[PDB]
Amino acid sequence: IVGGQECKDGECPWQALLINEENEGFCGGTILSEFYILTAAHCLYQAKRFKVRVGDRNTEQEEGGEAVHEVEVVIKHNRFTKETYDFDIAVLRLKTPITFRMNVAPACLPERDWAESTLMTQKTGIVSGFGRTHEKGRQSTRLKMLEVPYVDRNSCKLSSSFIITQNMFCAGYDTKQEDACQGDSGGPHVTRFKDTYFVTGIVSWGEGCARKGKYGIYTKVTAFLKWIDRSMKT
């Protein structure tokens, strides 16, 4: 995350962190239920064997609320390709159920029609992650969040040098220096409605970070609600 703020105690309980064999985070994810995690398909390439950590807000030390979970089944969408980055979505079924507590709780899955009409028409969304604080730099050791405005679909298609498919949407600022970055991929993008946070996106990609004339690209969750449903059964 570039810009934005630190997630304070209990503010982003649905954040998950994929860690490699060296216990270092390479990507993010979203808690969907005691057994399921939502993330990006391109993250499944950032490492061979990885685990999921929840309840963490500061990577440097261990507060006592963290928990590492092993992945039982990896469910990546079969239409994903690094050539386009379309269908950038995956679901992880954990071996052990997540125990909800302070800083550990699921985000809500909304109904398609209502979400597109009521959530994505709101002004902004919320993105989070332990990613880079500057286009060039080391990952963050603190969990950060950032409010990013929904960008006109036409405006973003115009500003991109790659095809924005119907499985993606843009969020961010044209010139302002705030945006997600390397390391936040697969992380959560949620939208608030009456003090309730619904999952509306998945951190997917961007041309640089916070660059002028460039926005953030997210996987459109309302496009995969049934896919997600099936995944949480098989």
Added chain:
Amino acid sequence: KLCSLDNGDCDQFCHEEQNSVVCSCARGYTLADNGKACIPTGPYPCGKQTLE
């Protein structure tokens, strides 16, 4: 506007059936007796920050 009018007074999901407002909740919530509010069934309902 029904659903287009302040979400039809629903706490969460709003649908229009028979040209009337029908509210519904996400998994883990129960529709209250007024048929509009959504009541959580556990201590860690989805979508809520754990602020306590």
